Structures are given as structure tokens and as C-alpha cells.
Amino acid sequence: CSLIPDYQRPEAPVAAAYPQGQAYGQNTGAAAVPAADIGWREFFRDPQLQQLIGVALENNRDLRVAALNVEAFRAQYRIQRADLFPRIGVDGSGTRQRLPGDLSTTGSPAISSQYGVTLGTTAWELDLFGRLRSLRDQALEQYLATEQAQRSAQTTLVASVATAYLTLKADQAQLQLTKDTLGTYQKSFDLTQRSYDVGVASALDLRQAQTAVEGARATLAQYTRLVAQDQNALVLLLGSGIPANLPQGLGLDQTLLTEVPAGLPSDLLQRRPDILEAEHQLMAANASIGAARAAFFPSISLTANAGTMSRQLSGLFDAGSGSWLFQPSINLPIFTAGSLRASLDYAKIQKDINVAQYEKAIQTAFQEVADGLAARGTFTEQLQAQRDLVKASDEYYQLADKRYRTGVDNYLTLLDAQRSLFTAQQQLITDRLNQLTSEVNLYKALGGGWNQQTV
Amino acid sequence: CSLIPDYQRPEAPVAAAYPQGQAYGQNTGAAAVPAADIGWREFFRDPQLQQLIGVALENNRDLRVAALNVEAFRAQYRIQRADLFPRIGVDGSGTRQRLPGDLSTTGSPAISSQYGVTLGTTAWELDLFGRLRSLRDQALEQYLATEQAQRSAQTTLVASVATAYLTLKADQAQLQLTKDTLGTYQKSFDLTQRSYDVGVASALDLRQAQTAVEGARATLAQYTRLVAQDQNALVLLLGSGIPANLPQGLGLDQTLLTEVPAGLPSDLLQRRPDILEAEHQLMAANASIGAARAAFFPSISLTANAGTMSRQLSGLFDAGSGSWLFQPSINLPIFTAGSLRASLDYAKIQKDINVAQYEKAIQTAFQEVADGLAARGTFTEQLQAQRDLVKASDEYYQLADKRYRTGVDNYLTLLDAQRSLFTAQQQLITDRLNQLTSEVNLYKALGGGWNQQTV
Amino acid sequence: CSLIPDYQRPEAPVAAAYPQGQAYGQNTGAAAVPAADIGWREFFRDPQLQQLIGVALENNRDLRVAALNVEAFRAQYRIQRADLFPRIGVDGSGTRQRLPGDLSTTGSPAISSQYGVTLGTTAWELDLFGRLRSLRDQALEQYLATEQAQRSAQTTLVASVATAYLTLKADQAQLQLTKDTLGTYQKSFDLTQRSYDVGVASALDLRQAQTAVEGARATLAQYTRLVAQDQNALVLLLGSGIPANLPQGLGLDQTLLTEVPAGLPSDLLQRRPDILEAEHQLMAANASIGAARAAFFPSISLTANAGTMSRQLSGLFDAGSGSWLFQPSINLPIFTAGSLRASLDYAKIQKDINVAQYEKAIQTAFQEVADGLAARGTFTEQLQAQRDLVKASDEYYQLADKRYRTGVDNYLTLLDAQRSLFTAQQQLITDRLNQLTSEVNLYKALGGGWNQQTV
């Protein structure tokens, strides 16, 4: 009998197109290939982090945990799949009991004996009303939720390892520029020390140069700490150590990530795995509704066995000592004064709760992909302003170098312009890292790189 | 009879008065109307914010989830309410079985038959010592805890929506001020371009103005990203988007909130819902003590059913085929190695755990309201210092404007003072937003607006 | 016997030597006294902080929660320990039933009667293949896991108390130096007001001095907020009020901590308690395997009771009414579609999930210890840079004071020299506090002071 109600997908309350604004460009609309289709071998153009992701494909702990949990829920589904079949079980008994006089078969306290072994099925409940089929659907939906959870864990691990590698790649060049700053400040301090030893400058200019030398040295120590912490973070996110057979990495400013079209929100609930996980939870709640609905109807039970029984032990396996049994049973409670109706109410409440959580997850996913669209719309113009600033600092440094090589001004006002140059370009490298991290997070939230290659 | 232990509320280890110091303002004594009495329609002075809170009352997911969970705990309380009543039902039974020759009463392999359809009570659980009453009280306490969870969720939602709207307004005002800064830098760069094209200024003075206008352009892009993302963070918490027919949003420095007396910490013992969660969990643990202690006592069961039974089928519904049953049983385990004793002291330990977390919730609430009192005592003076800074910069700009229009200075050293004016002025909107956020989550931490109107 | 598979320790995937770099110092190899060896009392050299850890030893809430959960899992272990023994119980029985004529013993609607008081064992399983022993040491391993959770909570509490106390001292020193800043700014504003009232200085210098005075007055309120909020956090971590009988505190520049050797990656395999909790979860999953392995084997059941039965109520306690029963039973289900196989491989999969989580915990602990080693390798040079920066500003201030007292420059340049002096001085307390916080977190993650002294 059919008792699970018809499943229906709840409506997405968000707008069917992405909202616009001054930070956003033009919505390209729906496209042929969204971010769930492009694998991670095609998105990241650097081969080194690709080989790192290929290492983390098998050497990570949480991916192994989720891959085992998939098989766990598969075995839990197969347990209930086996429970639909009748359970054959060897049951061996034995009886030696005394009785009182008024209750005996003799009218006297005789010690009666009995022995019997049997095999067959006991309490074979027939799924006429779809209770065990509902539990089968519930175990199947939980297994599907587990594999969607493995997809989500793999995509988040890919994004985390990618951001850690790009952060290390940024901070290496930033440490190089801070070493350049320390060298510039050491040259400036040596020049002012020479000028103080000759007698032109006072002690105060020497102190005020040393106070900025110490500031550059402290910034160098901070950036070395950041480099080391990004290294040991990438080591943890990889599981194994950093390999030496890696290919040459590519620099940040040339494009390492391909562009993905924005698509539409609706295909995102077709493609993002946690929305499918909430959908599987909703279908599991509907299966529990079907189970609680099948709890109202009567229960059919069957017990059928065959074996040999006797009074003594050696006379059990004799010829003619066989015995068969057939008993059907029907159970139906009547006075359910708020037990089964409250259970059905509990199940309907669980379905409505999973509906609300499904719409909540839809709205959350829409919020983060809209934030990614905003970061995409703004970081290009931010790095354009940064690159123009670095260009202006470079022209300033070239003019100061021409002025120095003519002989008009000294090495001090060449050195400070040299300092301004790379303290501008390290603040280009910072926010180059931020556009790279924002694009990785936008690729992850739009469906992620569950597959390796493009479908 | 009932052997549930008596309930006593533990003593809070906090100070009876609010702590004092230097930045602490003077306490206004006992609060006649605290924050839990004050509704959200009276606290926020903006009609636009109250309209969107009225939207978020009905069109959010987790606020619906909490109410559905309240209905769920009501249903599971009704289950253990119905548990006290006996469960009668119909039981149909068929029997066709062979017997061995030595064990039969006739001495033959008899294929005997039996049929019957009985009606009545089987295994009637009798609550003689309040075990089922203790489970009913545990279900009721969990229902009250789920009831308080909806108030906690509504207060956190009201605070989050209020702070999100305030951050949106503050970001819009700061975006307008960065637009003015970009206009000022554009005018100054055009004037330096004119001076360089004439021949009075060198290229270096052009390059530094270019760096200034590029840095301001990057800051404008960053603040436009902030404005674009805070609308997303608001629309996510609202569920729906921003409506078109909205009331006029009042100003940030204009009064948007009302004063709330902090009163006493003991009033928070009546008013913050998480302490009520810990209290309901404590009483549920006491109900579990009652259950585990009533598990010691003997359990009485009853089986009484009547109906028709026969050897054959069509002779079931005959005259005189009726028969009744009466079987009272009493089960009592005696010798264990402290099994039920371990269940009993396990439940007592669960009570002591709930006492300890009941005290830690009081300590967390005390620390939160003390941080709110510190922010209240500091922000009113910090914003006054910022306002004095703003008016000093405004007097500076006015004197520079008079000095410009008399002809003494050029437009550049008017524009830089005009620039310093609103770059100091955005530091009023910043920390005005922080004072408003501190007052909002202090209002939430004191109990919040669970009701719409003040009682 | 026992079907439990024998346990052996999995492989630690990380490198067995601490990784080296430019910021990393020399590894001192393995050491006999790690962080878990010495107690917390001789580590923190402040007697006040030791007294606050001493009152945190008893007056905290989560420590009490952890000790009570330890006793809870002990009681749950004693439940399964008592489960080996037979449950001897008394079962009082009454029986009065009518029967149909074709099924009765007389051919008549006879009302048969029976009464009985019986005492003995029912359904007593005999642990032949080690299932109940597996559940017993499963609960025992969970109890040891809860003990390691208690140790982890205690070490986390000690680390949090130490960080809060040192942050209190740092914020107090920063508040004192910002008070000195407000004083010098007020003196500079008074001298500028005198110069404006005489007539030498225009109003613009007065405005731009007043803006600086307001900028320092904002920082004063911003730091006196943080002093009080950190006092609040300390009171929350302490669980009670701040004691008035405290010993004197020692400042941050004095030796507050002691040297702890980093040792080896293997030493944490013995000493950090969350790894011990993970391997206790390992042994719990292995005991789950050992409990699931007994389902394939036959199970023993026993039912044996003696007592007095009769047909009448008062005729129960009569001579000759004593009777006994002996009933053995053997159960073995045979036909399944992989039910018990999937349950067993499900338990094995849970064990493999546990080995993967056990490796992940070791990897995260190694990452945290690498962060602590990098902070130790860098904050010494950062503090040296801040210290000789302070010394340079002090020599600057002394030369400016000599130049003032000979009469060359005014009080104004002396005041703005003292301004930068204690600015660079308050920039030492930040990154002194960060070094001490990093060393406290390193001592926590390396094993912590679970004991009070060294043993």
C-alpha cells in the first residue's frame, strides 16, 4: 500500500536573476557550463598546486573519513535491505520443571521434561503498508546525503589548499621586498653615520634614522613569521609534507584562474552539494512521515518453523519426531489517546522543519555567491588603482635616479624614493592575494571542484 | 505515590550589584521596566527598521523552525501524557501445527488447529511510584526549554537585523564622504596638471598627486564593496529582499534607540532566556533522577482481554464462544552489582552537571552585561571627542575658506583642508555605528524585545 | 574465548623531526622533562597568577562539568560491569481466565485459576564469545577518554587564565602611558593657547593642536574600555570575584615564564591529552568491532526460577508447593542478505574513521607546536627591535631636554619629543604581551600543567 505522500521541491524565494548595482557589471545570464562542471585541473593554471591537490586526493584525513562514511551508510542501507527478507534462525530449547499438585497433569508434583530444536522464521512482518520501504528510502536518502557531504568536504579542502599555496606564494615575494627595505634603510643609516662622524649632521638625525631602521627590521620579523606560518599551514592542509618534485610555480599577476560565468541561482541548487543534502534530509523526513503513517495500520506477523521435539535427549532425532508450525498474527491497537497522532504530528513537524532549513540554505548560498560577485566586481578596479600607483612610484624613482646621476641630489633622497617604490608594489602583491582568494572562494561556493576535469 | 526530589534554585556566585570603576557610570538602581518588558516596536525609533523587523517576524526560516520545534516538544509531551493510559487493541491469531508422538496428549502426530480474535489490554504499565509521571515532567521541562529557545532566537534575530541596517546606513554615509574625497583629489590633481602644463611645477609634484588620487580611488572601490555586501547581509537575515514602499530612515547621529535601565543581575535571572534553558534542563535532570529512582521499585503489569476463540474458523462467531482473561504480574529485580544504583547516581551526576552549567550561564550573562555597561560608559565620551575633532576641523576649513576668498592662498591649500574636514567627519559615523551596535546587543543581552509592544 | 581483534598503534604521518628554517632556532633534540612533566606552579613566575590558577582549580564550572562527566562514564562502565551477573528477580503472577468449550479441558466454559510466586533468573546471556566484556571495556575506554577531556579542560583553563592576567597587565601599562600622552598634549595645548592669546600664533595652530588633543583623548577612552573588559573576562574565567588578599604582581619585562623544551613530535604522542582521547576513541571503536563479532556466533540464554504455585490464593505457601524450572536456549540466525556482515564491516569502517581522525589530531597538534616554535623564533628579535627603538627615543628625548634646559629650543619640541618617546614605549607592551601569550599557548599545546608541580 502507498502511504508516503508525494514529494515536491519547495520554491526558491530569491530573485531568479542576480541583483545589479554600481559595483556589479552586466549579468551574463545563464550559461552552458557552470562552476560545478569545470574541474580543478582546468581552473588552476599553476601545475604545482595541482600536483598538491593530486596528493591531497588520497593523503588527506577528512576526505578519507567521508569516503569511509559513504560506505558506512551503504552498509546501513544494505542492513535494512536485508531486513525485508525473513529471518531464518536455529532455536534450540530445553525444559525440566517441577509443578505443584493442583496444577500438574498428574495431580502430583511430577518433574516433567521436554526437549526441542527447530529452524524457521519468527515474526516475519510483511511490509504491506510501506513501513520498511519507507525505512529503505530513508537509509537511501541518508547515504545520498553522505556522498553529497563527501563532495562538499572535497571542494572545501581543494579551496583551502589553494588559498594556502597562493598565500605562501604572495608572502615569499613580500618577504623579498621587506629585505629590500631593510637593505635600503641600512644604507641610509650608514650614510647618516658617516655624516655624523664627519660632523655635518647632529646626533638627532642619526637617532631618527635608527628609529625607522628598527621599524623596517620589525616588519621583516613579522613577515618571516607569516611566511613560516603559511608553510606549516600548507603542510597541515596537505597531510603529507611539502614535496620536492613539484613543478615551477607561476606568478600571481599573470592569470592563474580562468573565469567562470555567473549563470543563474537555480542551477546552483541543482549543483551545490549541501542544498542537495538538505533536500535529502527533507526526503528522509517524508520517509519518516510514511513510516509514522504506516504505524497506524494493523501489523501482520508470521511464524513458521520445523524441527524435532521429544521428551528425552536421545529420542530427539528419531524417525517420526518431526513437527511443523504455522501461525499468523494480526495486531492493531485502538486506544491511541494522543500517541500515534502525536507521532504523526512529530513527523509532519520534521518535514516542515526540513522545508524551512532547505529554504534557509538556499538563501545562505545565494548570499555568499552575491558577495563573491561583489568582490569580483570591485577587486579588478582596486588592483587597477594599485597598479597605476606602482607605475607612478616607478616613474618617480626613475626621475629621482636621473636627478641623482646628474649630480643634483644625494643618495638619501634616492633611497627614500626607492623605499616608496617597493612599499607600493608590496601593497600591490597584497590585494593581488585578496583577489586570488576571493576568486577561489567564489569558485568554491558556486559549486566547487568536485570533479578533476571539465565535464 | 511520587518520589521525585524537591527542586531548589542554586545561588548565583556573581556580585549582587553591578561592578564599578572608572569608566563605569553610576547605576540607576533597580529597574522598574527592564529590557525584557520593552518591545522592539518601542526601542527602535526608525519606522523603516520596525517595518523590516515585522517582515522578519514572519518571513524568516529559523524563527519558524523554533516554533515548529515547540510544537514538536508539545507532541512528544502529549505522547508521554498518553503513556499513563492503558493500550487496548485487537489480536487475531491462527494456529496449525504438528506435534511429535511422544509429546502429544493423544500419542499421535496431530495436525492440530486453533483460531481466535481477542480484544483488550496487554502489559498495562502502572505508574504506582511516579516513574511515568517523572517522564511526563521531563517532557514538560523540555517543552518549556524549547519554548524559551524561540525567544532566544527572536532576540538574536532582532539584534542582528538592527545592527545590519545600521551598518548599511553608516556605510552609505561613509561612501558619500569618500565620493567627496575623490572629487577633492580630482580637483587638486587637475590643478597640479595645469601647473605642470604651464611649467611652474615639475613632474614629481604631478606624480605624488597621482598617487594620492589613486589611493582614494582604491578606498572608494573598497567602500562601495562594503555597501554592496551589507545589503546582502541584511537581505539574508530578512529572508525577503528590501521592499520599495519603505518609511524614511532617520539619521545615524539622530536618536534611533531608547534608554534601557540595566537594573540588577538577579533580574536577568528572570529575564534572559538561556538561564531559563539551564533551569529547565536542571529540572529535566531532576525528573530523570525521579525516573531512575522509581526504577528500583516493583513494576506492575496487567493483561486482560476478551473475545472469541475456537478450534476451527467458521465456529469462531458462535454463541458461547466468548472467553475472558485476567493476568496481573509483578516484576522486581533484586540482586545486581549496583546496576540500578549506577543508573541512580548517573542521574544525580546529570543533575550536578546541569547545576554547574546553570552557574556558568549566569557567569556568561554577567560578563556580557558588564561588557555592555563598559561600552555604554565609554562610547558617549568617545563620540563627544570625535565631535569636538570634527568641529575643530570645520573651524579650520572655515578660516581657510576666508583666507582663500581674500586672495591670500591658492585653491590647493583650501582643498586639502576641505579634504581633512570630511576625512575627520567619517570618524564620527565610525564609532557612531559602534555605539549603536553596542547599545543594540546590550539590549539583546539584557533580555531583548521578545514581545512586539511593551507590557 | 574472545573474538576481539588485537590493537596496535597506527603510523604518525608527520615528520619525526621538527622542520627548520631561517626563523627557526636550533632543535635541542629529545628532552626528559617536557611541558606535561613540570606543573603550572613553577612555570608562571608571578605568585598572583599562581593564586588565581589555584582558585580556578576549584571554583571553575567547566572543570566541575568534566569531573562529573568522568564520574558519569564511570557509572556507565559499572552498569556494563554489573551486566555480566544474572538479574535475579521475583515475578508474582495471578491468572483467572474463561475458555471456550471446544478449546477447554472439560468441554465447558471453565474459568481456570492459577497463582504463583517465583524467584530466579530470566533470559540470562552467557558471554561465551566476549560481547559483554567488549561492551564493558568499551565503556571503560570512554571513561578514560572523559578523563583526558578533563585534563584538556584544565589545561585550557590555565592557559586562558594566564592570557587574561597578562592582557590585564598590558592594558594597564598602556592606559598609564596614554594618561601621560594626554598630559603632555594638554600642556602643549595650553602653551599654544598662551601663544594665541598673546598674538604671535594664529588660530589655525590652535585648531590643529586641539585636534591632536582630542585624538589622544579618544585613545584614552579606548584603552580604559579594554582594561575593564579584560577585567570582566578575567572574572568570567575565574568563576568568582577578584581576591583582595592577592600577592604582588610582577611586570611584563621581568621573567614571568620559564623555558620549556620543544622535544620531538613523538613526545606529544604520549603527552597531549586530546591525542589520548582520540586513541581511547580508537579502542572504543575496536571494542565495538569485538561486540559486533559475537552476532555471527550462537548466543546462550537461560531461564531458571523456583517458588510456590497453586490454584488458590491462600493455598500458595503450603508444603509440597515448592517447584523449580530449568530452561536453556541457543539462538543462531542463519539466512541474511548481508545483515550481520554489513553491521560488522560498519563497525570496521567506524574504526577506520577513528584511525583517520586520530591521525588528523596529531597533524593539527603538530601544526600548533610549529606555530609556537615560529613565534618563539621571531618574538625575541621583535622585542629586541622594540627595545632599542625605545632606547633610541630615550636618547632623543634626553638630548632634547638638554637642548631645552640650555635655552635653545622651547618647551614645545620637548613635549613632542616626549610624545614620540612614550609612543614608542607603549609600542613595546604590545608585542611583549603577544610574546607572552604565544609562549602560554605553546605551553598549553605542548601538554600543559595538568599536575601542579613537577614529579
Q: Is B106 on the interface with A (CB under 8 A)?
A: no
Contact criterion met (CB below 8 Å) for B400 and B413? yes
> Cα angle vertex C123, ends C120, C128, to 5°?
115
Question: What are B216's three cell numbers?
Answer: 582614494
Contact criterion met (CB below 8 Å) for B316 and B310? yes
Distance, in Å, from the CA atom of C87 to the CA atom of C123, rounded to the nearest integer, reads: 9
Q: Length of chain B, please?
A: 455
Distance, in Å, from the CA atom of A60 to the CA atom of A64, rounded to the nearest integer, reads: 6
- Give the residue carrying C-alpha cell 591537490: A53
3-class secondary-structure state, position A329: strand
> Nearest Cα to A429, choosing from A218, A160, A177?
A177
Question: What residues have CB less than 8 Å from A106, skipping those under 6 apart?
Answer: none
Query: From residue A434, how far is each of A105, A170, A389, B257 by CA, in Å?
Result: 92, 10, 17, 37
Phi/psi zone of residue B20: left (φ > 0), alpha (ψ -120 to 50 degrees), beta?
beta
- Burial class from Cβ neighbours inside 10 Å (0-12, 13-18, 19+) for residue A170 reads buried
Long-range contacts of C123-127 (CB under 8 A, 24+ apart): C123/C301, C123/C302, C123/C303, C124/C86, C124/C87, C124/C301, C124/C302, C124/C303, C125/C299, C125/C300, C125/C301, C125/C302, C126/C300, C126/C302, C127/C84
3-class secondary-structure state, position A120: strand
- Give the residue carrying C-alpha cell 603550572: C40
Taking every pair of Cα atoms in chain C, the longest distance, rounded to a whole number of angstroms, is 135
Contact criterion met (CB below 8 Å) for A150 and A67? yes
Q: Length of chain A, please?
A: 455
3-class secondary-structure state, position A112: strand
Q: Is B61 on the interface with A (CB under 8 A)?
A: yes
Strand partners of residue B331: B299, C91
Distance, in Å, from the CA atom of A187 to the CA atom of A194, rounded to the nearest integer, reads: 11
- The dihedrals phi and psi of C46, each to the nearest 5 degrees, come to -90, 125
Distance, in Å, from the CA atom of A121 to the CA atom of B329, rounded to the nearest integer, reads: 29
Distance, in Å, from the CA atom of C301 to the CA atom of C87, rounded to the nearest integer, reads: 12
Q: Which chain B residues contact residue A309 at CB under 8 A? A: 99-100, 103
Distance, in Å, from the CA atom of B421 to the CA atom of B398, rounded to the nearest integer, reads: 10
> Nearest Cα to A207, choosing from B384, B178, C397?
C397
Distance, in Å, from the CA atom of A369 to the CA atom of A36, rounded to the nearest integer, reads: 13
Give buried/exposed letters for C125-157 (b at 16+ CB in 10 A, else e).
bebebbbbbbbbbbbbbbbbbbbbbbbbbbbeb
Contact criterion met (CB below 8 Å) for C115 and C178? no
Give buried/exposed letters for C254-292 (b at 16+ CB in 10 A, else e).
eebbeebbbbbbebbeebbbbbbbbbbbbbbbbbbbbbb
Q: Is A64 on the interface with C (CB under 8 A)?
A: yes
Question: What residues have CB less than 8 Å from B405, skipping those under 6 apart?
Answer: none
End-to-end Cα spacing for chain C: 41
Distance, in Å, from the CA atom of C379 to the CA atom of C388, rounded to the nearest integer, reads: 14
Q: Which chain B residues contact residue A338 at CB under 8 A? A: 78-79, 81-82
Q: Which chain C residues contact residue A88 at CB under 8 A? A: 333-335
Distance, in Å, from the CA atom of A181 to the CA atom of A219, rounded to the nearest integer, reads: 10
- Burial class from Cβ neighbours inside 10 Å (0-12, 13-18, 19+) for residue A409 reads exposed
Contact criterion met (CB below 8 Å) for B165 and B49? yes
- What is the CB neighbour count within 10 angstroms for residue A335? 12
Full DSSP string of C278-336: HHHHHHHHHHHHHHHGGGSS-EEEEEEEEEEEESSSTTSS-TT-EEEEEEEEEEEEEE-
Contact criterion met (CB below 8 Å) for A115 and A93? yes
3-class secondary-structure state, position A336: coil
> Nearest Cα to B426, choosing from B165, B171, B177?
B177
* Residue of chain C with shortest Cα separation from A226: C374
3-class secondary-structure state, position A453: coil
Question: What are A44's three cell numbers?
Answer: 588552476
Question: What are A194's three cell numbers?
Answer: 658617516
The structure's method of determination equals cryo-EM
Question: What are C116's three cell numbers?
Answer: 504463583
Distance, in Å, from the CA atom of A419 to the CA atom of B127, rounded to the nearest integer, reads: 85
> Nearest Cα to B167, choosing from B441, B443, B384, B388?
B441
Query: In A286-353, at which residue ranges do the beta strands (DSSP E only) sit?
Result: 299-310, 322-333
> Nearest Cα to B53, choosing from B454, B449, B455?
B449
3-class secondary-structure state, position A207: helix
Dihedral of alpha carbons A204, A210, A214, A220, sign: positive
Residues 211-230 of B with CB under 8 A from A: 211, 214-215, 217-218, 221-222, 224-225, 227-229
- The percent of chain A in helix, strand and coil, each rounded to the nearest 5, is 60, 10, 30
Q: Is C241 on the interface with B (CB under 8 A)?
A: yes
Tell me, letter by letter, the H, E, C secondary structure of C64-131.
HHHHHHHHHHHHHHHHHHHCCCCCEEEEEEEEEEECCCCCCCCCCCCEEEEEEEEEEECCCCCCCCCH
Q: What is the DSSP letter of A295?
A: T
> Nearest Cα to C64, choosing from B351, B432, B147?
B351
Full DSSP string of C407-454: TSS-HHHHHHHHHHHHHHHHHHHTTTHHHHHHHHHHHHHTT---SSS-
Breaks following residues of chain B (C-to-N distance > 2.5 Å): none
Distance, in Å, from the CA atom of B357 to the CA atom of B367, rounded to the nearest integer, reads: 15
> Nearest Cα to B361, choosing from B281, B444, B278, B443?
B278
Distance, in Å, from the CA atom of B104 to the CA atom of B101, rounded to the nearest integer, reads: 5
- What is the CB neighbour count within 10 angstroms for residue B208? 14
Q: Is B331 on the interface with C (CB under 8 A)?
A: yes
Query: From residue A42, how far is each of A59, A455, C132, C380 by CA, in Å?
Result: 21, 11, 54, 44
Name the pairing type of β-strands A322-333 and B88-97. Answer: antiparallel
Contact criterion met (CB below 8 Å) for C4 and C293? yes
Q: Which chain B residues contact residue C207 at CB under 8 A? A: 392-393, 395-396, 399
Dihedral of alpha carbons C132, C134, C140, C143, sign: negative
Q: Which chain A residues contact residue B212 at CB under 8 A? A: none
Closest Cα in chain C, distance from residue B360 (Å): 6
Contact criterion met (CB below 8 Å) for C311 and A103? yes
> Nearest Cα to B253, choosing from B377, B396, B426?
B426
Give buried/exposed letters for A33-55 (b at 16+ CB in 10 A, else e).
ebbbbbbbbebbebebbbebbeb
Tell me, letter by letter, the H, E, C secondary structure of chain B.
CCCCCCCCCCCCCCCCCCCCCCCCCCCCCCCCCCCCCCCHHHHCCCHHHHHHHHHHHHCCCHHHHHHHHHHHHHHHHHHHHHCCCCCEEEEEEEEEECCCCCCCCCCCCCCEEEEEEEEEECCCCCCCCCHHHHHHHHHHHHHHHHHHHHHHHHHHHHHHHHHHHHHHHHHHHHHHHHHHHHHHHHHHHHHHHHHHHHCCCCHHHHHHHHHHHHHHHHHHHHHHHHHHHHHHHHHHHHCCCCCCCCCCCCCCCCCCCCCCCCCCHHHHHHHCHHHHHHHHHHHHHHHHHHHHHHCCCCEEEEEEEEEEEECCCCCCCCCCCEEECCEEEEEEEEECCCHHHHHHHHHHHHHHHHHHHHHHHHHHHHHHHHHHHHHHHHHHHHHHHHHHHHHHHHHHHHHHHHHHHCCCCCCHHHHHHHHHHHHHHHHHHHHHHHHHHHHHHHHHHCCCCCCCCCC
Question: What residues have CB less than 8 Å from B258, skipping those under 6 apart?
Answer: B38, B42, B43, B45
3-class secondary-structure state, position A91: strand
**Nearest-by-Cβ selection for C85 from B337, B346, B389:** B337
Q: Is A323 on the interface with B (CB under 8 A)?
A: yes
Distance, in Å, from the CA atom of B418 to the CA atom of B398, rounded to the nearest integer, reads: 9
Cα torsion through B99, B102, B105, B110, rounded to 10: 30
Distance, in Å, from the CA atom of B365 to the CA atom of A257, rounded to the nearest integer, reads: 47
Q: What is the DSSP letter of C246?
A: P
Full DSSP string of C143-183: HHHHHHHHHHHHHHHHHHHHHHHHHHHHHHHHHHHHHHHHH
Element (H, E) at A111: strand A111-121
Single-letter amino acid code for the residue at C316 = L
Distance, in Å, from the CA atom of A434 to the CA atom of A56, rounded to the nearest integer, reads: 24
Query: Chain B interface, mutation test: which of A106, A303, A369, A378, most B Cβ atoms within 10 Å?
Result: A378
3-class secondary-structure state, position C338: coil
Question: What are B408's three cell numbers?
Answer: 591670500
- The dihedrals phi and psi of A311, each to the nearest 5 degrees, come to -90, -35
Distance, in Å, from the CA atom of B286 to the CA atom of B290, rounded to the nearest integer, reads: 6
**Nearest-by-Cβ selection for C371 from A100, A232, A241:** A232
Question: What residues have CB less than 8 Å from C189, skipping those under 6 apart?
Answer: C209, C210, C213
- Give the residue carrying C-alpha cell 552498569: C79
Query: From residue C240, how far is each of A61, B19, C163, C237 by CA, in Å?
Result: 42, 13, 17, 8
Distance, in Å, from the CA atom of B111 to the CA atom of A326, rounded to the nearest integer, reads: 10
Q: What is the DSSP letter of C15?
A: -
Element (H, E) at A92: strand A88-92
Tell me, letter by letter, the H, E, C secondary structure of C387-408.
HHHHHHHHHHHHHHHHHHHCCC
- Give the residue carrying C-alpha cell 555597501: B227
Question: What residues have CB less than 8 Å from A388, skipping those under 6 apart?
Answer: B210, B214
Distance, in Å, from the CA atom of A325 to the CA atom of A331, rounded to the nearest integer, reads: 19
Phi/psi zone of residue C260: left (φ > 0), alpha (ψ -120 to 50 degrees), beta?
beta
Full DSSP string of C30-57: --SS-TTTS-STTTS--HHHHHHHHHHH
Single-letter amino acid code for the residue at B212 = A
* Residue of chain A with shortest Cα separation from B85: A337
Distance, in Å, from the CA atom of A372 to the CA atom of A391, rounded to the nearest integer, reads: 28
Q: What is the CA radius of gyration of chain B?
A: 37
End-to-end Cα spacing for chain A: 41
Contact criterion met (CB below 8 Å) for C448 and C35? yes
> Cα angle vertex C268, ends C264, C272, to 5°?
155
**Nearest-by-Cβ selection for B218 from A349, A360, A382:** A382
Question: What are C266's three cell numbers?
Answer: 613523538
Element (H, E) at A142: helix A131-198
CB hemisphere CA count around A312 (13 angstroms):
4
CA A297 vs. chain centroid, Å, equals 41
> Nearest Cα to A401, choosing from A411, A392, A391?
A411
